[PDB]
Amino acid sequence: KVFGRCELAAAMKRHGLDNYRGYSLGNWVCAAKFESNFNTQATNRNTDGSTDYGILQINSRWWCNDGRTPGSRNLCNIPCSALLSSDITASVNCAKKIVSDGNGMNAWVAWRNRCKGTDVQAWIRGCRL
Ligand SMILES: [Cl-]
Ligand code: NA
């Protein structure tokens, strides 16, 4: 499913992401925009053979099992395919563990490079939240 900007902001906010660990809602929407273009079905393969899955491009090297990343962890204890659902619940719950592991949203390279230090509130401007 391809989300609308405000549609996704609303879903993220209902799932507890607003100001989660100090990251305002615009941070999460900005990250999703540049990680996946708001597409829950986005997948991208990394050079080391792991794959990033879903709206937040969660990596199979650490966070989910896709059966083809040898020597990887499954810290969110879910199959990576559950992160491509139109329901963003699993992506959101997994994102909550990732952002809590000590590096904050720097775990998302697109957020670090494209959202960090910008006016992220502009990503929820105009939305009915
Ligand atoms: Cl980037
Ligand atoms: Na894995």
From Swiss-Prot:
- Which keywords, in A-to-Z order, does the entry hold? Allergen, Antimicrobial, Bacteriolytic enzyme, Disulfide bond, Glycosidase, Hydrolase, Secreted, Signal
| Gene Ontology terms: biological process | cell wall macromolecule catabolic process; defense response to bacterium; defense response to Gram-negative bacterium; defense response to Gram-positive bacterium; killing of cells of another organism
Q: In which tissues is it expressed?
A: In the egg white and polymorphonuclear leukocytes.
Entry EC no(s): 3.2.1.17
Broadest EC class?
Answer: hydrolase
Q: Where is the active site?
A: 35, 52
One annotated GO molecular function is: beta-N-acetylglucosaminidase activity
Q: Which reaction(s) does the protein catalyse, per the Swiss-Prot or TrEMBL entry? A: Hydrolysis of (1->4)-beta-linkages between N-acetylmuramic acid and N-acetyl-D-glucosamine residues in a peptidoglycan and between N-acetyl-D-glucosamine residues in chitodextrins
Q: What is this protein called?
A: Lysozyme C
Record localization: Secreted
**Sites where the protein binds substrate:** 101
Beyond the main fields, what else does the record say?
A: Lysozyme C is capable of both hydrolysis and transglycosylation; it also shows a slight esterase activity. It acts rapidly on both peptide-substituted and unsubstituted peptidoglycan, and slowly on chitin oligosaccharides.
The subunit structure is: Monomer.
Which family does this protein fall into? Belongs to the glycosyl hydrolase 22 family.
Record's keyword annotation contains Chaperone? no
Pfam name, any one: Lys
Q: Which domain of life is it from?
A: Eukaryota
Kindly indicate whether the keyword Protease belongs to this entry.
no
Q: Which GO terms describe its cellular component?
A: cytoplasm; endoplasmic reticulum; extracellular space
Name its species: Gallus gallus
Q: What does this protein do?
A: Lysozymes have primarily a bacteriolytic function; those in tissues and body fluids are associated with the monocyte-macrophage system and enhance the activity of immunoagents. Has bacteriolytic activity against M.luteus.
Residue pairs linked by disulfide bridges in the UniProt entry: 6-127, 30-115, 64-80, 76-94
The residue ranges of the C-type lysozyme domain are 1-129
